[PDB]
Amino acid sequence: SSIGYEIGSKLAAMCDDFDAQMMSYSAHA
Amino acid sequence: SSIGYEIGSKLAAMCDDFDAQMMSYSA
Amino acid sequence: EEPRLDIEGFVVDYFTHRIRQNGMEWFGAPGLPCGVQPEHEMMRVMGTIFEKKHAENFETFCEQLLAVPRISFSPYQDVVRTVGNAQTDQCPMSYGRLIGLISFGGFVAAKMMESVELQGQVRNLFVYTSLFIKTRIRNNWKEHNRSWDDFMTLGKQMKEDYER
Amino acid sequence: NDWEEPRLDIEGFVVDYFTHRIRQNGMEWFGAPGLPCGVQPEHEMMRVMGTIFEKKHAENFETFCEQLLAVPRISFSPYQDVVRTVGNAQTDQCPMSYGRLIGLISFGGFVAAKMMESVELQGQVRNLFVYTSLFIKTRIRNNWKEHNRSWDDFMTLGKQMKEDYE
């Protein structure tokens, strides 16, 4: 294993990047 | 001024070198 | 918590969607008592967008998971647990992590089905993915101002940009 | 054109980088407008490109700062001359290449950090931020499409270059 932790670290970064982008539409007004 | 041009010219040169280095990445 | 929006329902619908998108049919897919929701159709879109962005990486992740001796299930749990415990100043289960976990899990589900030898572990994949997300979602969303309605609004906007 | 996306508005890059640079100097910029979108991966990459740019020319940045402080009344005009010169500096590529973009934000962030070390200079920090942002905004508008440059390509090259220094 140990591989799951590193695969997970990458998934989380990708996930946070997606969230950041998606959370930019809460940017109007 | 003339100081701003001088600094600007050197920063321009530094920037162009940085860009060239970046362009060396279509690899 | 509308039974209509139960997490297990989102996982099942997306996994089913991704498997079918791979040219197959999931005959072990439990039923969705309330049917296909609009929130589900949005997750399908977000999941597809997410996968296209990281398709190559998803492929590599699968290969590495297949290199684990006996193709054990625990390393995948390590993946999921790591995403949920990565650290952040917001919701540990943000829309991005939710989409990432369901998108990757669906990708893996579709690949596993192409192998009769791995089909048995598909139940582990969806039960565990659903339970983990569930235990994580509330007691964690109502305190970071996150909700399905907000998911839909932002998701609607993002969907349009990608549809040109 | 991805540089037209509200998410990727130049003001965002400048505010984020300037804020980041000031903090690196052990300070808290409590007068920085907010990021009406939150920190983006592209800002993350700019922080790295900017850090590498500064380290490459740390000595010169210091000397430049000293020369600017030697101008009577420490007027803001000479700084605009710096910025304008970098943009009008000839090339057969984009007048506002990734390199110049990075150089302007990196030097600007450095200057912002130093200026915050002086109460007397803090007021002019608004000028620094606003002007830098507006100048770069105009130049990208009339240069990126033509010379086929984009944030996606920027990101592609930035990752590879971040790897070499990593």
Specify the amino acid at residue A20. Answer: A
D64–chain A nearest CA distance, Å: 36
Closest by Cα among C107, C127, C111, C131 to C119? C111
* Half-sphere exposure in the Cβ direction for A15 (13 Å, CA): 29
Contact C73, C123 (CB under 8 A): no
**CB-neighbour burial class of residue C134 (10 A; exposed 0-12, middle 13-18, buried 19+):** middle
Which own/partner pairs from D66-74 qualify as long-range (CB within 8 Å, at least 24 positions apart)? D67/B3, D67/B6, D67/B7, D68/B3, D68/B7, D68/D111, D70/B3, D71/B1, D71/B3, D74/D121, D74/D124
Contact C68, A3 (CB under 8 A): yes
Judge A/C contact: 3 or more CB pairs < 8 A. Answer: yes
Contact D138, B2 (CB under 8 A): no
For residue C100, the tally of other CB atoms under 10 A from its CB is 26
Instruction: Give how far Cα A19 sits from Cα of A24, C3, D46, D83, D97, Å.
Output: 9, 26, 19, 34, 29
User: Cα(C92)–Cα(B5) distance, rounded to whole angstroms?
Assistant: 50
Instruction: Give how far Cα C122 sits from Cα of C15, C40, C51, Å.
Output: 10, 20, 19
Contact C83, A15 (CB under 8 A): yes
Instruction: Give how far Cα C141 sits from Cα of C5, C129, D83, Å.
Output: 14, 18, 46
Structural determination approach: X-ray
User: Cα(C105)–Cα(C8) distance, rounded to whole angstroms?
Assistant: 13
A 1-29 near C (Cβ less than 8 A) = 1, 3-5, 7-23, 25-26
Closest by Cα among C81, C146, A24, B15 to D49? B15
Q: Which residues contact D69 (CB under 8 A, 6 or more apart)?
A: none
User: Cα(A14)–Cα(C54) distance, rounded to whole angstroms?
Assistant: 8
User: Cα(D112)–Cα(D27) distance, rounded to whole angstroms?
Assistant: 11
Specify the amino acid at residue C83. Answer: V
| Cβ–Cβ below 8 Å for D157 and B18 | no
Which one is the CATH code of D1-166: 3.40.50.10210, 3.20.20.60, 1.10.760.10, 1.10.437.10?
Answer: 1.10.437.10
Closest by Cα among C99, C109, C102, C125 to C26? C109
Give the gyration radius of chain A's Cα atoms. Answer: 13
Closest by Cα among C20, C28, C30 to C110? C20
User: Cα(D126)–Cα(D29) distance, rounded to whole angstroms?
Assistant: 12
User: Cα(D110)–Cα(D82) distance, rounded to whole angstroms?
Assistant: 14
Q: In Å, what resolution does this model reach?
A: 2.2
* Half-sphere exposure in the Cβ direction for B11 (13 Å, CA): 33
**CB-neighbour burial class of residue C103 (10 A; exposed 0-12, middle 13-18, buried 19+):** buried
Fold of C1-164: Apoptosis Regulator Bcl-x (1.10.437)
Q: Which residues contact D50 (CB under 8 A, 6 or more apart)?
A: D17, D21, D102, D105, D106, D109
Q: How far is CA D134 from the centre of its chain?
A: 11
